[PDB]
Write an enzyme that holds these catalytic residues in place. Structure first.
Site, PDB file in Angstrom:
ATOM      1  N   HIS A 198       0.755  -1.434  -0.156  1.00 12.45           N
ATOM      2  CA  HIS A 198       0.189  -0.174  -0.128  1.00 12.45           C
ATOM      3  C   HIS A 198       1.128   1.426  -0.032  1.00 12.45           C
ATOM      4  O   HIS A 198       1.620   1.289   0.910  1.00 12.45           O
ATOM      5  CB  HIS A 198      -0.862   0.050   1.208  1.00 12.45           C
ATOM      6  CG  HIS A 198      -1.890   1.277   1.283  1.00 12.45           C
ATOM      7  ND1 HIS A 198      -3.165   1.193   0.607  1.00 12.45           N
ATOM      8  CD2 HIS A 198      -1.679   2.433   1.480  1.00 12.45           C
ATOM      9  CE1 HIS A 198      -3.899   2.262   0.695  1.00 12.45           C
ATOM     10  NE2 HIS A 198      -3.025   3.287   1.319  1.00 12.45           N
ATOM     11  N   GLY A 199       0.601   2.280  -0.864  1.00 19.96           N
ATOM     12  CA  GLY A 199       1.207   3.426  -0.844  1.00 19.96           C
ATOM     13  C   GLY A 199       0.516   4.525  -0.600  1.00 19.96           C
ATOM     14  O   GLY A 199      -0.685   4.483  -1.062  1.00 19.96           O
ATOM     15  N   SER A 200       1.014   5.672  -0.239  1.00 21.15           N
ATOM     16  CA  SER A 200       0.265   6.700  -0.021  1.00 21.15           C
ATOM     17  C   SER A 200       1.218   7.897   0.130  1.00 21.15           C
ATOM     18  O   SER A 200       2.459   8.020  -0.172  1.00 21.15           O
ATOM     19  CB  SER A 200       0.027   6.499   1.627  1.00 21.15           C
ATOM     20  OG  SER A 200      -1.188   7.372   1.667  1.00 21.15           O
ATOM     21  N   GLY A 207      -1.232   9.677  10.077  1.00 25.97           N
ATOM     22  CA  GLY A 207      -2.487   8.830  10.189  1.00 25.97           C
ATOM     23  C   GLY A 207      -2.464   7.358   9.996  1.00 25.97           C
ATOM     24  O   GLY A 207      -3.416   6.791  10.742  1.00 25.97           O
ATOM     25  N   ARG A 214      -7.883   2.590   6.860  1.00 26.24           N
ATOM     26  CA  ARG A 214      -9.279   2.795   7.123  1.00 26.24           C
ATOM     27  C   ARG A 214     -10.126   2.862   5.989  1.00 26.24           C
ATOM     28  O   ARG A 214      -9.426   3.334   4.838  1.00 26.24           O
ATOM     29  CB  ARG A 214      -9.894   3.798   8.001  1.00 26.24           C
ATOM     30  CG  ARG A 214      -9.148   3.534   9.863  1.00 26.24           C
ATOM     31  CD  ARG A 214      -9.815   4.752  10.679  1.00 26.24           C
ATOM     32  NE  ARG A 214      -9.209   5.905  10.320  1.00 26.24           N
ATOM     33  CZ  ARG A 214      -9.683   6.823  11.171  1.00 26.24           C
ATOM     34  NH1 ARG A 214     -10.262   6.857  12.086  1.00 26.24           N
ATOM     35  NH2 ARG A 214      -8.770   8.010  10.747  1.00 26.24           N
ATOM     36  N   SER A 240       1.640   0.227  -5.988  1.00 24.59           N
ATOM     37  CA  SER A 240       1.644   0.948  -5.178  1.00 24.59           C
ATOM     38  C   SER A 240       2.346   2.228  -4.908  1.00 24.59           C
ATOM     39  O   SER A 240       1.986   3.207  -4.231  1.00 24.59           O
ATOM     40  CB  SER A 240       1.835  -0.177  -4.101  1.00 24.59           C
ATOM     41  OG  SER A 240       0.629  -1.119  -3.656  1.00 24.59           O
ATOM     42  N   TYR A 243       1.096   5.570  -6.184  1.00 25.46           N
ATOM     43  CA  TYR A 243       0.501   6.307  -5.101  1.00 25.46           C
ATOM     44  C   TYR A 243       1.107   6.994  -3.958  1.00 25.46           C
ATOM     45  O   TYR A 243       0.476   7.495  -3.167  1.00 25.46           O
ATOM     46  CB  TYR A 243      -0.631   5.370  -4.650  1.00 25.46           C
ATOM     47  CG  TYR A 243      -1.727   4.662  -5.719  1.00 25.46           C
ATOM     48  CD1 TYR A 243      -2.574   5.546  -5.953  1.00 25.46           C
ATOM     49  CD2 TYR A 243      -1.481   3.627  -6.320  1.00 25.46           C
ATOM     50  CE1 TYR A 243      -3.627   5.263  -7.164  1.00 25.46           C
ATOM     51  CE2 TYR A 243      -2.587   3.065  -7.208  1.00 25.46           C
ATOM     52  CZ  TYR A 243      -3.458   4.004  -7.589  1.00 25.46           C
ATOM     53  OH  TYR A 243      -4.319   3.621  -8.500  1.00 25.46           O
ATOM     54  N   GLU A 328      -5.437  -5.512  -8.288  1.00 27.72           N
ATOM     55  CA  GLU A 328      -5.580  -4.800  -6.846  1.00 27.72           C
ATOM     56  C   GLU A 328      -6.389  -5.647  -6.081  1.00 27.72           C
ATOM     57  O   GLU A 328      -7.428  -6.351  -6.551  1.00 27.72           O
ATOM     58  CB  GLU A 328      -6.052  -3.384  -7.326  1.00 27.72           C
ATOM     59  CG  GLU A 328      -7.102  -3.166  -8.161  1.00 27.72           C
ATOM     60  CD  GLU A 328      -7.395  -1.796  -8.384  1.00 27.72           C
ATOM     61  OE1 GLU A 328      -6.578  -1.128  -9.306  1.00 27.72           O
ATOM     62  OE2 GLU A 328      -8.350  -1.217  -8.029  1.00 27.72           O
TER      63      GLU A 328
HETATM   64  C1  LIG Z   1      -3.904  -0.766  -5.385  1.00 28.54           C
HETATM   65  C2  LIG Z   1      -2.799  -0.156  -4.716  1.00 28.54           C
HETATM   66  C3  LIG Z   1      -3.260   1.029  -4.026  1.00 28.54           C
HETATM   67  C4  LIG Z   1      -4.345   1.984  -4.513  1.00 28.54           C
HETATM   68  N1  LIG Z   1      -4.467   3.346  -4.170  1.00 28.54           N
HETATM   69  C5  LIG Z   1      -5.548   3.871  -4.459  1.00 28.54           C
HETATM   70  C6  LIG Z   1      -6.796   3.923  -3.564  1.00 28.54           C
HETATM   71  C7  LIG Z   1      -7.904   4.121  -4.394  1.00 28.54           C
HETATM   72  C8  LIG Z   1      -9.122   3.775  -3.754  1.00 28.54           C
HETATM   73  C9  LIG Z   1      -9.215   3.423  -2.294  1.00 28.54           C
HETATM   74  F1  LIG Z   1     -10.308   3.473  -1.691  1.00 28.54           F
HETATM   75  C10 LIG Z   1      -8.042   3.570  -1.790  1.00 28.54           C
HETATM   76  C11 LIG Z   1      -7.784   3.290  -0.146  1.00 28.54           C
HETATM   77  O1  LIG Z   1      -7.350   2.223   0.192  1.00 28.54           O
HETATM   78  N2  LIG Z   1      -8.345   4.158   0.923  1.00 28.54           N
HETATM   79  C12 LIG Z   1      -9.023   5.241   0.524  1.00 28.54           C
HETATM   80  C13 LIG Z   1      -8.450   6.631   1.074  1.00 28.54           C
HETATM   81  N3  LIG Z   1      -8.584   6.262   2.520  1.00 28.54           N
HETATM   82  C14 LIG Z   1      -9.982   6.591   3.077  1.00 28.54           C
HETATM   83  C15 LIG Z   1      -9.868   6.752   4.571  1.00 28.54           C
HETATM   84  C16 LIG Z   1      -7.901   5.163   3.048  1.00 28.54           C
HETATM   85  C17 LIG Z   1      -6.108   4.940   2.936  1.00 28.54           C
HETATM   86  C18 LIG Z   1      -5.752   4.048   3.925  1.00 28.54           C
HETATM   87  O2  LIG Z   1      -6.039   4.455   5.184  1.00 28.54           O
HETATM   88  C19 LIG Z   1      -8.547   3.894   2.301  1.00 28.54           C
HETATM   89  C20 LIG Z   1      -6.853   3.753  -2.398  1.00 28.54           C
HETATM   90  C21 LIG Z   1      -3.559   3.719  -3.171  1.00 28.54           C
HETATM   91  O3  LIG Z   1      -3.655   5.036  -2.790  1.00 28.54           O
HETATM   92  N4  LIG Z   1      -2.307   3.077  -2.836  1.00 28.54           N
HETATM   93  C22 LIG Z   1      -2.210   1.781  -3.200  1.00 28.54           C
HETATM   94  O4  LIG Z   1      -1.027   1.371  -2.762  1.00 28.54           O
END
Ligand SMILES: CCc1cn(Cc2ccc(F)c(C(=O)N3CCN(CC)[C@H](CCO)C3)c2)c(=O)[nH]c1=O
Length: 349
Positions: A198-200, A207, A214, A240, A243, A328
């Site tokens: 998981h990338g961010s 957080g 979450r 990932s 992202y 994914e």
């Molecule tokens: C496939 C690997 C990948 C995808 N994506 C895009 C993505 C798209 C839709 C999503 F719902 C989420 C996601 O997981 N969410 C949404 C935001 N937040 C909401 C509180 C959370 C964050 C974690 O707390 C939970 C992520 C990343 O960003 N990184 C990755 O490695």
């Protein structure tokens, strides 16, 4: 008088840099002056999501005129942008909507970081030690000659996707992650436990480490999430890593490895924001990619399948429309997630 290992001190200094968050929010055009990050509340962010849902309603109704203009004006008023001289643009594509959700997501994780760093000082503890305590998440550096480092490096390098050729990745450091409570919440009973990426953005790790991964809140528009309001993982490191939104000038980022209790996957070829209602018993959604690690190289680490590369073709092809390049995975409850490793990664563009 910091009592932390220097590597952890570096990590805390990296992720708690409120001024770096300020810079990133300005590159997303959020007005850091009119609505300071220190003046950020859950209510401000909730009102922003509600404005984005009104925008979604206009888009699904095909209303690109007055109703959309004022719904957008309301979003920009609640979430102040600084577009300088230009007029705030309309939001009508899914990607345009997604860009605003991502902005609200960073604000929410920055709000958590602000409360943490501005939290009650001590004078007995070094500030970094306070911030680390206020994470309620153990971060333990691993030796670069360790076995764990060797397998994670292999996972990182061997699952870099071929279509992500503009950059390579160098593992600068590696931490074991143990967030308070995640072990006791985790669905150990579920099968298909995998160690996934998981990338961010850099703004979000305080957080993520503090509150865990979450779900998007109910007030968020559903079409912003291609497979529903879940937590998204990849088995290809670079998918990932994209992202992280690292840049030539800011080419240091973090990647997260988590044990994910997938259970039985509902397999899907193309996006569907309502995919969670299709589970009906199954425990996760798997978007099928055309390239994926194969079982022959899978190894096991503390009870989780590490899908080591190289990747090969899967014969998967969507005739109905667009085909995902890479898998994914989506779970819809954080009790199917246990964070495991935090990688400090250098992006070599
Ligand atoms: C496939 C690997 C990948 C995808 N994506 C895009 C993505 C798209 C839709 C999503 F719902 C989420 C996601 O997981 N969410 C949404 C935001 N937040 C909401 C509180 C959370 C964050 C974690 O707390 C939970 C992520 C990343 O960003 N990184 C990755 O490695």
């Amino acid at each position: 008088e910091s009592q932390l290992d220097l590597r952890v001190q570096e990590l805390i200094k990296l992720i708690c840099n409120v001024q770096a968050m300020e810079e990133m929010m300005m590159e997303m055009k959020y007005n850091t002056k009119k609505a300071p990050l220190g003046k950020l509340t859950v209510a401000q962010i909730k009102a922003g999501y509600q404005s984005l849902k009104k925008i979604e309603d206009c888009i699904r109704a095909g209303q690109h005129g007055r109703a959309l203009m004022e719904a957008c004006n309301e979003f920009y008023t609640r979430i102040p942008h600084d577009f300088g001289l230009r007029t705030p643009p309309l939001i009508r594509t899914q990607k345009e909507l997604s860009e605003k959700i991502q902005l609200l997501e960073a604000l929410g994780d920055i709000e958590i970081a602000i409360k943490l760093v501005k939290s009650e000082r001590q004078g007995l503890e070094h500030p970094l030690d306070q911030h680390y305590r206020n994470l309620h998440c153990a971060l333990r550096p691993l030796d670069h000659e360790s076995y764990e480092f060797k397998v994670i490096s292999q996972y990182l390098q061997s699952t870099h996707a071929p279509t992500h050729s503009d950059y390579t990745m160098t593992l600068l450091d590696l931490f074991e992650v143990e967030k308070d409570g995640e072990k006791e919440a985790f669905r150990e009973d579920l099968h298909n436990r995998m160690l996934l990426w998981h990338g961010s953005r850099m703004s979000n790790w305080v957080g993520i480490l503090s509150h865990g991964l979450r779900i998007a809140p109910p007030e968020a528009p559903i079409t912003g999430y291609m497979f529903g309001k879940g937590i998204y993982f990849a088995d290809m490191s670079s998918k990932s890593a994209n992202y992280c939104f690292a840049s030539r000038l800011k080419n240091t980022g973090l990647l997260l490895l988590s044990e994910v209790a997938l259970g039985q996957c509902n397999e899907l070829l193309e996006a569907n924001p309502k995919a969670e209602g299709l589970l009906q018993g199954k425990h996760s959604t798997k978007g099928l990619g055309k390239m994926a690690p194969s079982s022959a190289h899978f190894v096991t680490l503390n009870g989780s399948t590490v899908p080591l590369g190289p990747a090969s073709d899967t014969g998967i092809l969507n005739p109905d429309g667009y085909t995902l390049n890479y898998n994914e995975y989506i779970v819809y409850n954080p009790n199917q997630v246990r964070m495991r490793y935090l990688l400090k990664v250098q992006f070599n563009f």
